[PDB]
Amino acid sequence: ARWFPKTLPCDVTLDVSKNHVIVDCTDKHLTEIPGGIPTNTTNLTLTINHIPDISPASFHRLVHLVEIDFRCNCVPIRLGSKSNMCPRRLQIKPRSFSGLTYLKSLYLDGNQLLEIPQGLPPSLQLLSLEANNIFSIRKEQLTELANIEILYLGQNCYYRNPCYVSYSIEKDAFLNLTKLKVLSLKDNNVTTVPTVLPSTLTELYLYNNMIAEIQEDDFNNLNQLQILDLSGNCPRCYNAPFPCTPCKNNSPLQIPVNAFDALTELKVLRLHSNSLQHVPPRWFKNINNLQELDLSQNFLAKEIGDAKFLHFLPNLIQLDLSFNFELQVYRASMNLSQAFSSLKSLKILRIRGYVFKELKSFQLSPLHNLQNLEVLDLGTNFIKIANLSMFKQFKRLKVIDLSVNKISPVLEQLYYFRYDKYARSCSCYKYGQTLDLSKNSIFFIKSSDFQHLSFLKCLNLSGNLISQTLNGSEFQPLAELRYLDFSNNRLDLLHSTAFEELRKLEVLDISSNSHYFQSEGITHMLNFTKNLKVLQKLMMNDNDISSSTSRTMESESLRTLEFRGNHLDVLWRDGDNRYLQLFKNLLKLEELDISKNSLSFLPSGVFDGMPPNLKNLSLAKNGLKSFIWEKLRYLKNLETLDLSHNQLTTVPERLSNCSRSLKNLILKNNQIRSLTKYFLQDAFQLRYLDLSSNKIQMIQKTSFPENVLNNLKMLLLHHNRFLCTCDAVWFVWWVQHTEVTIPYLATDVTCVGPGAHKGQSVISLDLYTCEL
Amino acid sequence: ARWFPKTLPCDVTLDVSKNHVIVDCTDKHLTEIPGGIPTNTTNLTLTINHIPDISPASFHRLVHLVEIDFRCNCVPIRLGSKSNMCPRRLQIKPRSFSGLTYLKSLYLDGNQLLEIPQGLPPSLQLLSLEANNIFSIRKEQLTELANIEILYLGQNCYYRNPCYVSYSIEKDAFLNLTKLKVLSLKDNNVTTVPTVLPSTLTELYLYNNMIAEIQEDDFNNLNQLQILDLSGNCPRCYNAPFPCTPCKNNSPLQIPVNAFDALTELKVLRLHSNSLQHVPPRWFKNINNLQELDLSQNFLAKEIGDAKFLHFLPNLIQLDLSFNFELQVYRASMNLSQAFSSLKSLKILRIRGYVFKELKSFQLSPLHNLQNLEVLDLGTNFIKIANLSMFKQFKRLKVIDLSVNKISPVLEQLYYFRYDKYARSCSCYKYGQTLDLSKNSIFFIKSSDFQHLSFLKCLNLSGNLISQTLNGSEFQPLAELRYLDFSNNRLDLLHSTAFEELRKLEVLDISSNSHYFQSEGITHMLNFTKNLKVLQKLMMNDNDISSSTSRTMESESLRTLEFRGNHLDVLWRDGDNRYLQLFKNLLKLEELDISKNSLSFLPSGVFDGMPPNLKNLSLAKNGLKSFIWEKLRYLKNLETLDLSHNQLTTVPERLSNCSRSLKNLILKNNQIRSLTKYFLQDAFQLRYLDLSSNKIQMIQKTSFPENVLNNLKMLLLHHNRFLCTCDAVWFVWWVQHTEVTIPYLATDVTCVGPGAHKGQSVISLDLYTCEL
Ligand SMILES: CCCCOc1nc(N)c2c(n1)N(Cc1cccc(CN3CCCC3)c1)CC(=O)N2
Ligand SMILES: CCCCOc1nc(N)c2c(n1)N(Cc1cccc(CN3CCCC3)c1)CC(=O)N2
Ligand SMILES: *[C@@H]1O[C@H](CO)[C@@H](O[C@@H]2O[C@H](CO)[C@@H](O)[C@H](O)[C@H]2NC(C)=O)[C@H](O)[C@H]1NC(C)=O
Ligand SMILES: *[C@@H]1O[C@H](CO)[C@@H](O[C@@H]2O[C@H](CO)[C@@H](O)[C@H](O)[C@H]2NC(C)=O)[C@H](O)[C@H]1NC(C)=O
Ligand SMILES: *[C@@H]1O[C@H](CO)[C@@H](O)[C@H](O)[C@H]1NC(C)=O
Ligand SMILES: *[C@@H]1O[C@H](CO)[C@@H](O)[C@H](O)[C@H]1NC(C)=O
Ligand SMILES: *[C@@H]1O[C@H](CO)[C@@H](O)[C@H](O)[C@H]1NC(C)=O
Ligand SMILES: *[C@@H]1O[C@H](CO)[C@@H](O)[C@H](O)[C@H]1NC(C)=O
Ligand SMILES: *[C@@H]1O[C@H](CO)[C@@H](O)[C@H](O)[C@H]1NC(C)=O
Ligand SMILES: *[C@@H]1O[C@H](CO)[C@@H](O)[C@H](O)[C@H]1NC(C)=O
Ligand SMILES: *[C@@H]1O[C@H](CO)[C@@H](O)[C@H](O)[C@H]1NC(C)=O
Ligand SMILES: *[C@@H]1O[C@H](CO)[C@@H](O)[C@H](O)[C@H]1NC(C)=O
Ligand SMILES: *[C@@H]1O[C@H](CO)[C@@H](O)[C@H](O)[C@H]1NC(C)=O
Ligand SMILES: *[C@@H]1O[C@H](CO)[C@@H](O)[C@H](O)[C@H]1NC(C)=O
Ligand SMILES: *[C@@H]1O[C@H](CO)[C@@H](O)[C@H](O)[C@H]1NC(C)=O
Ligand SMILES: *[C@@H]1O[C@H](CO)[C@@H](O)[C@H](O)[C@H]1NC(C)=O
To answer: Where does guanosine bind (chains A, B) (predicted)?
Structure first.
């Protein structure tokens, strides 16, 4: 097909519209810029390599470069690999960028640079220098950046990349950058707000620094500023998972009451972890367009009961007052000021970590007529008592979050306490109203616990203590529930009527409920599915199921069953036929996951026992040592077969004689050492074949006919044990000249022998001596 | 040293007493009996190989054979490997055994034999034929066995190995085996007790068969019988994990009241799973010596409340009445007959699976004066209520077992429900009185829950629901407790006074209490250890610990800390020094397990931070990609270093220059491709080195000086990538002639190249062409 095999170890994509030729060499274990990069290349990415310097030669020919991403070719010691440390900082010779007359974006993050690289072209709008060793900014070094719009200078002086002195910025260093819109000086040991900043700024990031005081003039001219982040100046250090130095005398970040008066466009104000004890209403007199306010991680517990400043925030969309609790206090209740009722535009209110024992209905009354409220987050509060019926007054809300409490009858999980949540490195809400009770202390449930909550569409009970023999009487109010997460409980399936009161239930997760499955002699009614007549998806992973009182599960609605992490191996013990139809009467089942079931073999009858419409079958992670491929004939709708991570040593003699429907065959991470002579012959339906991470030496055209190979959307071959003799001449020619997508040709499709060619990439192999 | 390298692929042992030459070829992937077996061999084991036949050649030279163990060279299809099925039943040619005049024991189990092998010598005392296909016993085929004493014939006809007919035994088949003491016909589809059996029998196993009736004379002459097992005839089939057919009308096994009259010597009577509804006192009128009685898995719930037969069993040591509940009855209480008080010698009483809601003190009153009672097993009863103080009247007991119940304020776990618990295939009790409350529904504890139980030495609270912030007030009565198992709960370490009331605690297990360690911002006091002044061993595995409020753990007593399965990688994030002395002040710590902590590297300061007497360090399973060996100099008492299952690529240049104390170095399952030139030079302390499962090609004599090798107790080298060229000539010679124990030379110390010698064992290698 192809006339010229691409030997460049980089992905090349054309977007003809934009006008972009994209060359991506991310993580290609390079020590030089590869030769032969297309001269029309507009976007060149060299992230995560070990290229020790940049020079005039680097980009000589590439004069139509609009973006260079050269990040993390020498990342700071404590941020980088300890097994492959960078020996010596990136070296940028004079001249390296001045020729790139069209250069618009330059990323040099994480290269241990000591200075702002000079000689940059006047086309540059974005320059990024995060995680280098530049901790003194001089106006003379910024004159080259006349037209710069976005300047990232952060993470150059902080605990994971220390500079051991205070950051230094010359007076007015940035003022003549008359188009600068975004300046980030985060994580830099900065001690004062630099002045004067250009009035064109829209985004200013000064968080995680050592700024002890804001001067009243600091933001005087910033009448276009939309985002201001001063978080982490005078941090609140309790249970911080990074080294944390508070301001002395337990001072807050000192902010004069008129400090924001010029910020008439401000939309985002972030004051997280500033040790604030009060927030004066005067701050917000001239900020009427403010939409997002973050006051988490201060000392504002008392202020929350007063909060006069809220009267000045009628357009506020999101408010975060999380983790303002007083150390060593376990409040009886939450005192919300009535001033909360002035937040008529509020959609998201987060008050994690206030820390109180009992939530009462009236305590939430200031929120009753907030008609746009979508999310109420009272997580991580150690609440012991809450009558869930109080949320009958919150039908309009999308999410009510009571997660991580101690009640008894999405944000990345390290969110409020990580150092820099925006650090750049080298779910059932969609069903409707959601009550999240996950990780609480609920040991017993009864119908009245859910009185007045029939509007609920998703209930999350994951990670509670529920241990009772559910009999269809526990969720009677929840007539609209579509999704129940019951994972990480101790479900006892004594009654096959469990969950039957949830007549609209579409998704049920009872994964990680193994407790009562682990003890012999206990009744388990796995046929409880029969009563749920709109159930689509059932998850019962990691339940350690090795016994069942019922011989069959039944449903006319289920399409998806996850049954991973169980013991079908003992249920299907050789010589016991009783459970071989366990899934047969799930008549509409399309996807079955029975990975991780210790199935070292499949007894005969397993495939005959599958329900008739099975599309997606996983048998991964089973230690399967053998597989009668012909039995796939029973699976007449089989489309995806996942046999990854097993011990298989052979493929079928003729795949077409095993399944006429099979489209996607995943055989990665097995022990296959050779293919059968006619393996893929006439398997015209095959579209995806993964044989990576096996031990294949040879592939001949008889096993891999071109009439089948050319229809494949993807063919995975990497990490095998290819022998590159003259017997491999067809295989080597084909991979070099095929348009079928094969990943990791640059990385991991290599000869292991013979001697000469060991370790060499198959794509670069010259086998001319075989035709001499 | 050795003049003749041992090439036989079998372990050879001398017992001089003796008179034994033991050759063990278990699981050596043999297809023939290997040549060169010592002529003096007395015990020859060939179990689990694929030797297709036996002939007079097999054992020709071996005329001092006292035992042949030839098990499982052709296991029945459903009991054996599906990846290596046996093609053809074992073939025993004539005369193969008649020559072995001293043969006393012959095991031919699991070979698919169709008939009892003939021509066996008259010395034979033990013949074992389990799991073959012999299901018709003819007196003519037994005449060869005149002197036989032990005869195993079971598992020849049952669901895992069917014969599709009833077992057949000719009348008097065994009568003339006048020295037969042990006859086993279990798992055989037998329909009647064979008669007449020889009066010399001491043990008769007829369990798991189809015997519906015992005739009153079936055991008439067995006046020497000591063990009788009739279990699994008319089985009780509820929740059976094997195919189970009951007797029709669910009759019990019918046993005449005088059936045991001749059995005056009976010590063990097993009547498990016989669907008994009554046990007539008249059964035991002439059985005065009975010590063990198993009546589990019958229908004796009512009988337990009456039980007149117990008055006839004053010497009974063990009684098992487990799993006698009435189906689908949930009794309020346990009705134990007063007759239990006559069991004057009883030490073990097991009544699992009676199934009742409430245990009260007076219900155990029939046991108050059983002065020899040592264990009371009331597990798996679904008990909801029990005042634990009632056990103040059972201080003499060694174990009180309430495991697997529903209380709220060792037997292999497939024990009562396994088909054949004695099937042959091819803990804190030692601390004193134990109350086992594991796997219950205890969500809250207070001191009064343990009133009057101060005698307890071990409490098992594993797998409950305990979620509270322990503060030293929960276990106050337990003044003698030496061992607390608190694993699989939800420990909340808000207070560092947790557990301090247990002043005699020597072992604390708080493993798998990860729940509150998985949510950010929560207080965790890992320094609670300071208060436990005799704590020796602390297990906190799998707690997912990634954050801690205390920077240091402290103890003057702790010897052993298990900290596996946590996140020291994030606690020790590079650039965060705060936790680098977390373990330093555990001043007597000798053993530290910090495997499975995702430590792909160790930040500097980890070794300096270890406590001074650390002897045994595990860093296994961490993904370690690098290791500064010199840092071991800080660990001046280090004796064992376990780095198994990591990604290490190098060993230190000179181990002795890194650690003068190190005795045991485990490096198995790494990526090591070569040893340093002088690796072991002068490591006079080294006694144990494991380099197995790496990628070593070559080992030169400089790396392995013989003054060091000769002190090694063991050196593990198997599963590497040895190159057997003339450069390997020293290593090959050394391996062949050394006395150092190296395991698996027969199995897995092999050449991977060059071509000629691929797959060949190094021990068998002739490299004479290298000296031509
Ligand atoms: C030892 C095997 C006993 C039978 O199996 C079994 N399995 C379980 N999961 C459980 C269980 N019993 N029981 C005991 C039990 C036994 C029979 C009938 C009933 C229910 N009736 C209807 C109303 C009250 C009585 C409960 C309690 C439990 O929570 N769970
Ligand atoms: C958001 C973090 C809150 C602080 O941390 C924290 N961690 C825990 N594990 C828990 C916890 N609080 N609390 C709240 C809390 C906080 C401070 C003091 C006290 C108890 N005092 C003793 C005498 C008067 C009150 C309780 C309850 C709990 O069970 N557990
Ligand atoms: C931030 O700046 C401070 C100084 O303002 C740095 O602290 C100094 O560090 C050196 C050596 O570590 C000490 O000798 C000085 O006494 C320190 N001064 C103070 C005021 O502490 C600090 O290291 C800088 N932070 C980072 C991450 O580099
Ligand atoms: C135990 O013996 C019974 C009969 O004594 C066997 O049952 C017969 O099995 C054959 C073949 O499956 C059937 O055609 C007969 O109808 C059965 N007879 C009766 C009376 O049921 C049984 O197969 C044997 N069990 C094993 C494990 O081999
Ligand atoms: C190419 O560069 C331009 C300018 O920096 C950018 O807008 C575009 O997204 C880039 N395309 C990539 C990186 O694929
Ligand atoms: C919870 O509140 C409802 C009112 O919505 C009330 O009817 C119910 O009794 C309350 N439950 C408890 C336990 O107080
Ligand atoms: C329920 O909560 C758990 C625990 O916080 C979370 O991981 C899971 O995604 C939630 N389930 C759904 C369906 O949102
Ligand atoms: C489920 O299990 C058995 C039949 O398999 C039966 O006793 C029980 O009534 C069944 N219940 C349902 C709802 O199918
Ligand atoms: C050797 O055989 C005799 C007789 O069968 C037996 O008693 C002895 O235990 C055997 N020894 C070993 C080590 O197998
Ligand atoms: C116990 O049961 C036996 C027989 O079922 C009966 O004789 C006796 O009265 C019962 N006692 C109690 C206390 O239930
Ligand atoms: C438990 O029994 C003890 C007597 O041993 C008694 O003092 C105590 O009151 C009982 N506790 C309960 C909760 O009944
Ligand atoms: C406690 O009981 C569990 C079973 O529930 C067992 O796994 C564990 O070993 C026991 N602990 C001790 C110390 O015996
Ligand atoms: C420990 O907790 C109990 C109740 O949980 C409380 O009564 C007691 O005062 C606490 N102990 C101390 C020393 O505060
Ligand atoms: C544990 O550490 C805390 C400080 O983090 C301290 O207040 C407490 O008293 C310490 N407890 C012990 C037993 O050392
Ligand atoms: C070292 O501790 C491990 C537990 O990780 C133990 O299994 C091993 O036997 C110990 N080794 C020595 C030599 O004490
Ligand atoms: C390591 O070897 C050098 C040179 O022989 C020696 O000076 C040094 O003291 C040694 N270190 C240790 C810890 O033995």
So the answer is: 382, 406, 492, 523
